[PDB]
Design a protein around this ligand. Structure first.
Ligand SMILES: O=c1ccc2cc(O)c(O)cc2o1
Ligand SMILES: O=c1ccc2cc(O)c(O)cc2o1
Ligand SMILES: Nc1nc2ccccc2[nH]1
Lengths: 188, 185
Protein backbone atom coordinates (compact mmCIF):
# COMPACT_ATOMS: atom_id res chain seq x y z
CA UNK A 1 0.00 0.00 0.00
CA UNK A 2 2.99 2.42 0.37
CA UNK A 3 2.79 3.27 -3.37
CA UNK A 4 -0.76 4.62 -2.82
CA UNK A 5 0.30 6.49 0.34
CA UNK A 6 3.22 8.14 -1.56
CA UNK A 7 0.93 9.60 -4.25
CA UNK A 8 -2.81 9.34 -3.29
CA UNK A 9 -3.92 11.55 -6.22
CA UNK A 10 -2.71 9.00 -8.79
CA UNK A 11 -5.11 6.32 -7.43
CA UNK A 12 -8.21 8.08 -5.98
CA UNK A 13 -8.24 11.40 -7.93
CA UNK A 14 -8.28 15.00 -6.66
CA UNK A 15 -8.10 14.97 -2.83
CA UNK A 16 -9.05 18.69 -2.44
CA UNK A 17 -12.21 19.43 -4.51
CA UNK A 18 -14.28 16.45 -3.21
CA UNK A 19 -14.23 14.28 -6.37
CA UNK A 20 -11.66 11.90 -4.85
CA UNK A 21 -13.62 11.75 -1.57
CA UNK A 22 -16.80 10.61 -3.34
CA UNK A 23 -14.83 8.19 -5.57
CA UNK A 24 -13.98 6.38 -2.28
CA UNK A 25 -17.70 5.57 -1.85
CA UNK A 26 -18.24 4.67 -5.54
CA UNK A 27 -15.23 2.29 -5.57
CA UNK A 28 -16.72 0.42 -2.57
CA UNK A 29 -20.19 0.51 -4.21
CA UNK A 30 -18.85 -1.16 -7.41
CA UNK A 31 -17.49 -4.04 -5.30
CA UNK A 32 -20.78 -4.29 -3.35
CA UNK A 33 -22.80 -4.42 -6.61
CA UNK A 34 -20.53 -7.25 -7.89
CA UNK A 35 -21.34 -9.27 -4.73
CA UNK A 36 -25.07 -8.42 -4.99
CA UNK A 37 -25.22 -9.55 -8.66
CA UNK A 38 -23.89 -13.01 -7.66
CA UNK A 39 -27.16 -13.62 -5.83
CA UNK A 40 -30.86 -13.64 -6.45
CA UNK A 41 -32.28 -11.36 -3.78
CA UNK A 42 -29.59 -8.71 -4.31
CA UNK A 43 -29.57 -5.61 -2.10
CA UNK A 44 -26.98 -3.04 -1.11
CA UNK A 45 -27.41 -0.28 1.40
CA UNK A 46 -25.26 2.85 1.48
CA UNK A 47 -25.46 4.75 4.80
CA UNK A 48 -23.97 8.18 5.50
CA UNK A 49 -23.42 8.20 9.28
CA UNK A 50 -23.52 11.24 11.60
CA UNK A 51 -19.72 11.05 12.16
CA UNK A 52 -19.09 11.53 8.37
CA UNK A 53 -18.25 7.84 7.79
CA UNK A 54 -19.96 5.84 5.04
CA UNK A 55 -20.96 2.17 5.28
CA UNK A 56 -21.77 -0.05 2.28
CA UNK A 57 -23.43 -3.44 2.90
CA UNK A 58 -24.48 -6.20 0.50
CA UNK A 59 -26.42 -9.42 1.16
CA UNK A 60 -24.26 -11.55 -1.18
CA UNK A 61 -22.18 -14.65 -0.42
CA UNK A 62 -19.62 -12.83 1.75
CA UNK A 63 -15.96 -12.22 0.84
CA UNK A 64 -13.72 -15.34 1.24
CA UNK A 65 -12.38 -15.63 4.81
CA UNK A 66 -9.99 -18.63 4.61
CA UNK A 67 -6.23 -18.19 4.97
CA UNK A 68 -4.41 -17.45 1.70
CA UNK A 69 -1.71 -20.17 1.23
CA UNK A 70 0.96 -17.73 -0.05
CA UNK A 71 0.21 -14.61 2.04
CA UNK A 72 -0.60 -16.47 5.29
CA UNK A 73 -3.54 -14.20 6.23
CA UNK A 74 -7.29 -14.30 5.54
CA UNK A 75 -8.28 -13.89 1.87
CA UNK A 76 -10.35 -10.90 3.05
CA UNK A 77 -7.21 -9.20 4.43
CA UNK A 78 -5.38 -9.84 1.13
CA UNK A 79 -8.25 -8.09 -0.73
CA UNK A 80 -8.10 -5.13 1.72
CA UNK A 81 -4.25 -4.77 1.77
CA UNK A 82 -2.92 -5.73 -1.73
CA UNK A 83 -3.04 -3.30 -4.68
CA UNK A 84 -11.45 -0.27 -10.75
CA UNK A 85 -8.72 0.85 -8.34
CA UNK A 86 -9.67 -1.78 -5.70
CA UNK A 87 -11.00 -1.43 -2.13
CA UNK A 88 -7.36 -1.58 -0.90
CA UNK A 89 -6.94 2.03 -2.14
CA UNK A 90 -9.98 3.09 -0.07
CA UNK A 91 -8.56 1.21 2.95
CA UNK A 92 -5.13 2.88 2.53
CA UNK A 93 -6.69 6.38 2.45
CA UNK A 94 -9.13 5.73 5.36
CA UNK A 95 -8.06 6.66 8.91
CA UNK A 96 -10.38 3.85 10.07
CA UNK A 97 -12.11 1.00 8.22
CA UNK A 98 -14.39 -1.68 9.70
CA UNK A 99 -14.91 -4.95 7.79
CA UNK A 100 -17.78 -7.32 8.68
CA UNK A 101 -18.31 -10.56 6.70
CA UNK A 102 -21.22 -12.94 7.30
CA UNK A 103 -20.49 -16.35 5.77
CA UNK A 104 -21.01 -20.07 6.61
CA UNK A 105 -23.09 -19.23 9.71
CA UNK A 106 -20.31 -17.04 11.19
CA UNK A 107 -19.71 -13.30 11.71
CA UNK A 108 -16.13 -12.24 10.87
CA UNK A 109 -14.79 -8.86 12.05
CA UNK A 110 -11.62 -6.86 11.39
CA UNK A 111 -10.59 -3.23 11.95
CA UNK A 112 -8.04 -1.27 9.91
CA UNK A 113 -6.37 2.11 10.47
CA UNK A 114 -4.71 3.78 7.44
CA UNK A 115 -4.69 0.33 5.76
CA UNK A 116 -2.99 -1.41 8.71
CA UNK A 117 -5.01 -4.30 10.22
CA UNK A 118 -5.29 -3.94 14.02
CA UNK A 119 -5.70 -7.71 14.48
CA UNK A 120 -6.27 -10.80 12.28
CA UNK A 121 -9.79 -11.43 10.91
CA UNK A 122 -11.72 -13.01 13.78
CA UNK A 123 -14.92 -15.05 14.03
CA UNK A 124 -16.82 -13.09 16.69
CA UNK A 125 -20.26 -14.75 16.56
CA UNK A 126 -23.04 -16.51 14.66
CA UNK A 127 -25.56 -15.45 12.01
CA UNK A 128 -28.25 -16.82 9.66
CA UNK A 129 -27.54 -14.06 7.10
CA UNK A 130 -24.75 -13.67 4.53
CA UNK A 131 -22.92 -10.63 3.11
CA UNK A 132 -20.08 -8.12 3.33
CA UNK A 133 -20.07 -4.69 5.00
CA UNK A 134 -17.35 -2.03 4.88
CA UNK A 135 -17.63 1.17 6.92
CA UNK A 136 -14.84 3.70 6.39
CA UNK A 137 -13.74 7.04 7.84
CA UNK A 138 -11.88 9.03 5.13
CA UNK A 139 -8.39 10.14 6.24
CA UNK A 140 -8.35 13.86 7.09
CA UNK A 141 -4.57 13.81 6.45
CA UNK A 142 -5.28 13.02 2.76
CA UNK A 143 -8.71 14.59 2.13
CA UNK A 144 -8.66 18.39 2.61
CA UNK A 145 -11.08 21.30 2.03
CA UNK A 146 -14.12 19.12 1.12
CA UNK A 147 -14.33 16.42 3.85
CA UNK A 148 -18.12 15.87 4.21
CA UNK A 149 -20.27 13.62 1.99
CA UNK A 150 -22.85 15.44 -0.15
CA UNK A 151 -26.07 13.37 -0.38
CA UNK A 152 -26.98 14.57 -3.91
CA UNK A 153 -23.67 13.34 -5.41
CA UNK A 154 -24.26 9.82 -4.04
CA UNK A 155 -28.02 9.83 -4.81
CA UNK A 156 -27.48 10.84 -8.46
CA UNK A 157 -24.80 8.18 -9.10
CA UNK A 158 -26.71 5.36 -7.38
CA UNK A 159 -29.78 6.20 -9.51
CA UNK A 160 -27.68 5.94 -12.71
CA UNK A 161 -26.21 2.62 -11.49
CA UNK A 162 -29.64 1.09 -10.73
CA UNK A 163 -30.60 1.11 -14.44
CA UNK A 164 -27.37 -0.74 -15.44
CA UNK A 165 -27.80 -3.39 -12.70
CA UNK A 166 -31.19 -5.09 -13.08
CA UNK A 167 -32.66 -6.81 -10.02
CA UNK A 168 -30.32 -5.04 -7.57
CA UNK A 169 -32.01 -3.08 -4.77
CA UNK A 170 -29.95 0.03 -3.89
CA UNK A 171 -30.89 1.86 -0.67
CA UNK A 172 -29.35 5.20 0.33
CA UNK A 173 -29.72 6.46 3.92
CA UNK A 174 -28.54 9.70 5.54
CA UNK A 175 -28.37 9.46 9.35
CA UNK A 176 -27.49 13.20 9.67
CA UNK A 177 -30.93 14.48 8.52
CA UNK A 178 -32.93 11.21 8.16
CA UNK A 179 -33.26 11.47 4.34
CA UNK A 180 -33.35 8.26 2.27
CA UNK A 181 -33.94 6.81 -1.20
CA UNK A 182 -34.59 3.42 -2.80
CA UNK A 183 -33.44 2.69 -6.37
CA UNK A 184 -34.65 -0.69 -7.68
CA UNK A 185 -34.86 -1.23 -11.45
CA UNK A 186 -36.16 -4.71 -12.42
CA UNK A 187 -35.78 -4.46 -16.22
CA UNK A 188 -35.21 -7.46 -18.48
CA UNK B 1 6.72 -1.43 5.80
CA UNK B 2 3.14 -2.67 6.55
CA UNK B 3 4.57 -5.87 8.12
CA UNK B 4 6.25 -3.63 10.75
CA UNK B 5 3.07 -1.54 11.19
CA UNK B 6 0.99 -4.72 11.72
CA UNK B 7 3.12 -5.98 14.64
CA UNK B 8 5.42 -3.17 15.91
CA UNK B 9 6.29 -5.09 19.10
CA UNK B 10 7.93 -7.93 17.13
CA UNK B 11 10.44 -5.53 15.47
CA UNK B 12 11.12 -2.73 18.01
CA UNK B 13 10.11 -4.34 21.35
CA UNK B 14 7.29 -3.79 23.86
CA UNK B 15 5.42 -0.58 22.93
CA UNK B 16 3.71 -0.06 26.35
CA UNK B 17 6.50 -0.38 28.99
CA UNK B 18 8.99 1.98 27.24
CA UNK B 19 11.36 -0.71 25.88
CA UNK B 20 10.34 -0.20 22.24
CA UNK B 21 10.36 3.61 22.57
CA UNK B 22 14.01 3.69 23.69
CA UNK B 23 15.04 0.96 21.20
CA UNK B 24 13.95 3.43 18.46
CA UNK B 25 16.84 5.67 19.57
CA UNK B 26 19.31 2.75 19.84
CA UNK B 27 18.54 1.51 16.31
CA UNK B 28 19.28 4.97 14.87
CA UNK B 29 22.42 5.24 17.06
CA UNK B 30 23.79 1.94 15.63
CA UNK B 31 23.62 3.37 12.09
CA UNK B 32 25.14 6.68 13.26
CA UNK B 33 28.09 4.83 14.86
CA UNK B 34 28.76 2.92 11.58
CA UNK B 35 28.91 6.23 9.68
CA UNK B 36 31.02 7.87 12.43
CA UNK B 37 33.67 5.10 12.40
CA UNK B 38 34.34 5.41 8.63
CA UNK B 39 34.78 9.24 8.76
CA UNK B 40 37.50 11.51 10.20
CA UNK B 41 36.35 13.13 13.47
CA UNK B 42 34.06 10.26 14.60
CA UNK B 43 31.52 11.93 16.92
CA UNK B 44 27.78 11.39 17.36
CA UNK B 45 25.32 13.76 19.08
CA UNK B 46 22.07 12.39 20.55
CA UNK B 47 19.69 15.24 21.45
CA UNK B 48 16.42 14.84 23.37
CA UNK B 49 14.30 17.80 22.21
CA UNK B 50 11.63 19.65 24.21
CA UNK B 51 8.80 18.36 21.94
CA UNK B 52 9.60 14.66 22.73
CA UNK B 53 11.58 13.98 19.53
CA UNK B 54 15.13 12.64 19.38
CA UNK B 55 17.80 13.63 16.84
CA UNK B 56 20.99 11.66 16.14
CA UNK B 57 23.81 13.43 14.27
CA UNK B 58 27.05 11.97 12.92
CA UNK B 59 29.99 13.69 11.18
CA UNK B 60 30.68 10.83 8.74
CA UNK B 61 30.73 10.77 4.93
CA UNK B 62 26.95 11.18 4.49
CA UNK B 63 24.79 8.28 3.28
CA UNK B 64 24.44 7.86 -0.53
CA UNK B 65 22.01 10.32 -2.18
CA UNK B 66 22.13 9.07 -5.82
CA UNK B 67 19.22 7.27 -7.48
CA UNK B 68 19.02 3.52 -6.79
CA UNK B 69 18.90 1.78 -10.23
CA UNK B 70 16.37 -0.91 -9.14
CA UNK B 71 13.99 1.13 -6.94
CA UNK B 72 14.11 4.35 -9.01
CA UNK B 73 14.43 6.65 -5.96
CA UNK B 74 17.35 8.02 -3.88
CA UNK B 75 19.52 5.40 -2.13
CA UNK B 76 18.77 7.27 1.12
CA UNK B 77 15.02 6.72 0.62
CA UNK B 78 15.58 2.99 -0.05
CA UNK B 79 17.42 2.79 3.30
CA UNK B 80 14.57 4.66 5.06
CA UNK B 81 11.70 2.65 3.43
CA UNK B 82 12.87 -0.96 2.69
CA UNK B 83 13.42 -3.72 5.29
CA UNK B 84 20.23 -5.20 13.21
CA UNK B 85 16.56 -4.42 12.49
CA UNK B 86 17.11 -1.18 10.49
CA UNK B 87 16.14 2.51 10.56
CA UNK B 88 13.22 1.72 8.21
CA UNK B 89 11.48 0.24 11.30
CA UNK B 90 12.10 3.50 13.21
CA UNK B 91 10.76 5.48 10.22
CA UNK B 92 7.63 3.25 9.98
CA UNK B 93 6.81 3.80 13.69
CA UNK B 94 7.52 7.58 13.69
CA UNK B 95 4.66 10.06 13.11
CA UNK B 96 7.32 12.35 11.62
CA UNK B 97 10.97 11.86 10.59
CA UNK B 98 13.39 14.47 9.24
CA UNK B 99 16.45 13.29 7.26
CA UNK B 100 19.39 15.67 6.63
CA UNK B 101 22.42 14.48 4.62
CA UNK B 102 25.50 16.66 4.08
CA UNK B 103 27.59 15.17 1.26
CA UNK B 104 29.60 16.24 -1.83
CA UNK B 105 29.26 19.96 -1.01
CA UNK B 106 25.43 19.82 -0.75
CA UNK B 107 22.76 19.65 1.97
CA UNK B 108 19.94 17.17 1.19
CA UNK B 109 16.60 17.10 3.05
CA UNK B 110 13.57 14.78 3.19
CA UNK B 111 10.52 14.52 5.46
CA UNK B 112 8.59 11.33 6.25
CA UNK B 113 5.30 10.77 8.08
CA UNK B 114 4.61 7.23 9.38
CA UNK B 115 7.28 5.97 6.94
CA UNK B 116 5.73 7.71 3.89
CA UNK B 117 8.02 10.21 2.11
CA UNK B 118 6.31 13.60 1.64
CA UNK B 119 8.61 14.51 -1.27
CA UNK B 120 11.78 13.16 -2.94
CA UNK B 121 15.19 13.77 -1.31
CA UNK B 122 16.00 17.35 -2.38
CA UNK B 123 19.16 19.50 -2.46
CA UNK B 124 18.39 22.52 -0.23
CA UNK B 125 21.79 24.30 -0.06
CA UNK B 126 25.60 24.19 -0.01
CA UNK B 127 27.89 23.10 2.84
CA UNK B 128 31.55 22.40 3.67
CA UNK B 129 30.67 19.72 6.27
CA UNK B 130 29.69 16.06 5.83
CA UNK B 131 27.41 13.69 7.75
CA UNK B 132 23.89 12.38 8.31
CA UNK B 133 21.18 13.46 10.77
CA UNK B 134 17.83 11.85 11.57
CA UNK B 135 15.30 13.53 13.88
CA UNK B 136 12.18 11.44 14.62
CA UNK B 137 8.89 11.90 16.49
CA UNK B 138 7.66 8.54 17.88
CA UNK B 139 4.10 7.68 16.84
CA UNK B 140 1.79 8.09 19.86
CA UNK B 141 -0.60 5.65 18.14
CA UNK B 142 2.04 2.90 18.57
CA UNK B 143 3.83 3.98 21.77
CA UNK B 144 1.47 4.13 24.78
CA UNK B 145 1.83 4.68 28.57
CA UNK B 146 5.61 5.39 28.45
CA UNK B 147 5.72 8.12 25.77
CA UNK B 148 8.53 10.40 27.07
CA UNK B 149 12.25 9.55 26.80
CA UNK B 150 13.92 8.83 30.15
CA UNK B 151 17.44 10.35 30.12
CA UNK B 152 19.13 7.65 32.25
CA UNK B 153 17.97 4.80 29.95
CA UNK B 154 19.66 6.45 26.94
CA UNK B 155 22.75 7.47 28.96
CA UNK B 156 23.23 3.90 30.27
CA UNK B 157 23.23 2.36 26.76
CA UNK B 158 25.40 5.09 25.17
CA UNK B 159 27.99 4.55 27.94
CA UNK B 160 28.08 0.80 27.09
CA UNK B 161 28.51 1.67 23.39
CA UNK B 162 31.40 4.12 24.09
CA UNK B 163 33.52 1.33 25.65
CA UNK B 164 32.73 -1.02 22.74
CA UNK B 165 33.29 1.71 20.09
CA UNK B 166 36.50 3.18 21.54
CA UNK B 167 37.28 5.65 18.73
CA UNK B 168 33.81 7.26 18.69
CA UNK B 169 32.81 10.30 20.77
CA UNK B 170 29.19 10.16 22.03
CA UNK B 171 27.47 13.34 23.27
CA UNK B 172 24.03 13.20 24.93
CA UNK B 173 21.95 16.40 25.37
CA UNK B 174 18.58 16.96 27.08
CA UNK B 175 16.89 20.25 26.12
CA UNK B 176 13.97 19.71 28.56
CA UNK B 177 16.09 20.19 31.72
CA UNK B 178 19.52 21.13 30.26
CA UNK B 179 21.25 17.87 31.35
CA UNK B 180 24.28 16.65 29.37
CA UNK B 181 26.95 13.93 29.16
CA UNK B 182 30.00 13.11 27.01
CA UNK B 183 30.98 9.43 26.73
CA UNK B 184 34.42 8.72 25.25
CA UNK B 185 36.92 5.93 25.99
O1 LIG C 1 -13.12 -5.57 -2.08
C1 LIG C 1 -14.29 -5.73 -1.81
C2 LIG C 1 -15.13 -6.83 -2.25
C3 LIG C 1 -16.42 -6.89 -1.92
C4 LIG C 1 -17.03 -5.86 -1.12
C5 LIG C 1 -18.38 -5.84 -0.77
C6 LIG C 1 -18.90 -4.80 -0.02
O2 LIG C 1 -20.22 -4.77 0.31
C7 LIG C 1 -18.07 -3.75 0.40
O3 LIG C 1 -18.61 -2.73 1.12
C8 LIG C 1 -16.72 -3.76 0.06
C9 LIG C 1 -16.22 -4.81 -0.69
O4 LIG C 1 -14.88 -4.76 -1.03
O1 LIG D 1 22.69 4.49 7.12
C1 LIG D 1 22.11 5.17 7.93
C2 LIG D 1 20.70 5.11 8.24
C3 LIG D 1 20.16 5.90 9.19
C4 LIG D 1 20.97 6.82 9.94
C5 LIG D 1 20.48 7.65 10.95
C6 LIG D 1 21.33 8.52 11.62
O2 LIG D 1 20.86 9.33 12.61
C7 LIG D 1 22.69 8.58 11.28
O3 LIG D 1 23.48 9.46 11.93
C8 LIG D 1 23.19 7.75 10.28
C9 LIG D 1 22.33 6.89 9.63
O4 LIG D 1 22.88 6.07 8.65
N1 LIG E 1 -2.01 8.90 11.44
C1 LIG E 1 -1.47 8.04 10.58
N2 LIG E 1 -1.18 8.31 9.30
C2 LIG E 1 -0.64 7.12 8.80
C3 LIG E 1 -0.14 6.82 7.54
C4 LIG E 1 0.37 5.54 7.31
C5 LIG E 1 0.36 4.58 8.31
C6 LIG E 1 -0.14 4.87 9.57
C7 LIG E 1 -0.63 6.15 9.80
N3 LIG E 1 -1.16 6.75 10.92
Amino acid sequence: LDAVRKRPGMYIGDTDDGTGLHHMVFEVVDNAIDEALAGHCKEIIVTIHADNSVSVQDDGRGIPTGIHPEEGVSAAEVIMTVLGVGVSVVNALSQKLELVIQREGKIHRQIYEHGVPQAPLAVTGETEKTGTMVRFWPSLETFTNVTEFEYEILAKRLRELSFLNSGVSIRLRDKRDGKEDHFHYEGG
